[PDB]
Design a protein around this ligand. Sequence first.
Ligand SMILES: N=C(N)N1CCC[C@H](C(=O)NC[C@@H]2CCCN2C(=O)[C@H](CO)NS(=O)(=O)c2ccc3ccccc3c2)C1
Lengths: 9, 26, 257
Amino acid sequence: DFEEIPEEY
Amino acid sequence: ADCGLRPLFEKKSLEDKTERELLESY
Amino acid sequence: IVEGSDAEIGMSPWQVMLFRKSPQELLCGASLISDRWVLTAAHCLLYPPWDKNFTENDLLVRIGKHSRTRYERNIEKISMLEKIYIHPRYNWRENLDRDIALMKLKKPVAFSDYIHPVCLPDRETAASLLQAGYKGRVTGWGNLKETWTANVGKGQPSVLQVVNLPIVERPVCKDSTRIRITDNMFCAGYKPDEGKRGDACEGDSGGPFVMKSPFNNRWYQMGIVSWGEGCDRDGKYGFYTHVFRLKKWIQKVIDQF
Ligand SMILES: N=C(N)N1CCC[C@H](C(=O)NC[C@@H]2CCCN2C(=O)[C@H](CO)NS(=O)(=O)c2ccc3ccccc3c2)C1
């Protein structure tokens, strides 16, 4: 249950 | 900065909640 | 970790998290030694018996974190790896000897109050500090209890956990296990009748084992989380990779790549 990593990364 | 010197503690002259447990063990 | 305590903000500015891209999960812990270099355990990236093998872009490096799970924007920094360097004599086959890897970040992380490197030891420091009885500190985001079966214990923590462990004498360490110890790994933990306790556990592999130089106030990474039998078990100790013993190799990679 990890927060969504900023898709640019 | 140079390794091992923490900005929020050492560079501020503040010790953490248990570093004293370490230095004390020596 | 195990029998640990919530870390304070910026208490371990070198702590690094190893994060898997897909699925997104915590793989191991690591450490920042410079602006483009991170130190971890080799078995964190390679372990043939469990078909574990991650290439450069199978993972990310999250620096400056405190919360295990959240995305701390404006604090943490996520890097991408240019190259992974595993010790060429690393023994995954029998005892995890020389359990150490190095990772080259595509771009140098910037330093802040939450991101700062740790020091590597030198002869005089390794010599003076790595004496049994001396206490070092190990940090991580791993399980708060043994995994072994279906058991209770506050799963994983929401925040990074710190536990100050004492260094154990060699004859003791080697008598505690059937694995073949090697001068490239030390063991730390409290003995049965000492009363106190604590141990790294699953999810902390690769994590720093640091010490504070009373001769100059600098923190030095004496070890890296490698292996253990259970977690916080009586008569058992956690084994850590001997950085100093491997400092010559660490230097070759960095002074070439
Ligand atoms: N259990 C604890 N407290 N851990 C914390 C410290 C890091 C440990 C780690 O997993 N390391 C990866 C290695 C390689 C694969 C298995 N393993 C282990 O340390 C497991 C972890 O539960 N232990 S073991 O008892 O079965 C064990 C002990 C020593 C080992 C040495 C070489 C190869 C496999 C080993 C396996 C896990």
